[PDB]
Amino acid sequence: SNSKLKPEVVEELTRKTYFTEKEVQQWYKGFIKDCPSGQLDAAGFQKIYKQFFPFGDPTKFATFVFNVFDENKDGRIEFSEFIQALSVTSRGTLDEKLRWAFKLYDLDNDGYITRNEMLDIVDAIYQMVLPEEENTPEKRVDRIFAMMDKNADGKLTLQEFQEGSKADPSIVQALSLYDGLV
Numbered sequence: 001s002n003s004k005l006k007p008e009v010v011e012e013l014t015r016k017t018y019f020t021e022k023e024v025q026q027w028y029k030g031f032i033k034d035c036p037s038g039q040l041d042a043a044g045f046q047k048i049y050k051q052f053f054p055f056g057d058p059t060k061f062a063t064f065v066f067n068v069f070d071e072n073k074d075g076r077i078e079f080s081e082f083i084q085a086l087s088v089t090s091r092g093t094l095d096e097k098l099r100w101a102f103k104l105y106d107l108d109n110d111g112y113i114t115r116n117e118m119l120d121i122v123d124a125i126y127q128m129v130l131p132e133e134e135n136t137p138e139k140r141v142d143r144i145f146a147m148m149d150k151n152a153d154g155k156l157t158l159q160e161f162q163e164g165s166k167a168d169p170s171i172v173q174a175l176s177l178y179d180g181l182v
């Protein structure tokens with residue numbers, strides 16, 4: 001029950017994502033089995049991550065990701081938001097995944113990623129989870145800004161972030177997967 005989307009909603013979500021109608025319905029079944037209410041909350045989102053990272057404290061990073069999934073900022077991830085975020089992150093083009101990643105790093109949505117916003121995310125990633133030159137979130141952030149901040153003003157515009165990411169082979173590789181594979 002409800003474990004079926006209305007016809008118009010299947011048509012709409014299939015047209016807004018890289019999934020087939022059958023895939024959208026399969027994801028809804030899984031979403032509903034795990035979230036009876038159809039509303040994934042911050043705490044429920046925290047568990048999906050705690051699963052994959054029993055060793056670290058994924059609370060801060062899971063919260064950062066939750067906020068990007070929560071396109072309506074109502075504090076709950078509804079299926080439409082869930083499937084569209086899974087679509088871009090798992091199957092989007094490189095340019096699409098970069099725009100999503102920018103949204104993740106630009107904490108206050110002002111169009112620039114400041115050094116401190118990036119540090120917050122990277123520190124969260126380290127807390128969630130090395131060679132000396134990358135053993136602290138501050139060193140990782142300094143290298144990223146050395147490589148991407150072209151006008152050297154301490155902030156990355158979407159253009160600096162996209163170009164800077166495309167210049168780095170490891171970043172290009174990480175954002176070029178489709179269902180986890182090249």
Ligand SMILES: [Ca+2]
Nearest residue numbers: 070072076077
């Ligand atoms: Ca929401």
Ligand SMILES: [Ca+2]
Nearest residue numbers: 106108110112
């Ligand atoms: Ca910002």
Ligand SMILES: [Ca+2]
Nearest residue numbers: 151153155156
């Ligand atoms: Ca800049």
Ligand code: NA
Nearest residue numbers: 166167168169
């Ligand atoms: Na390159």
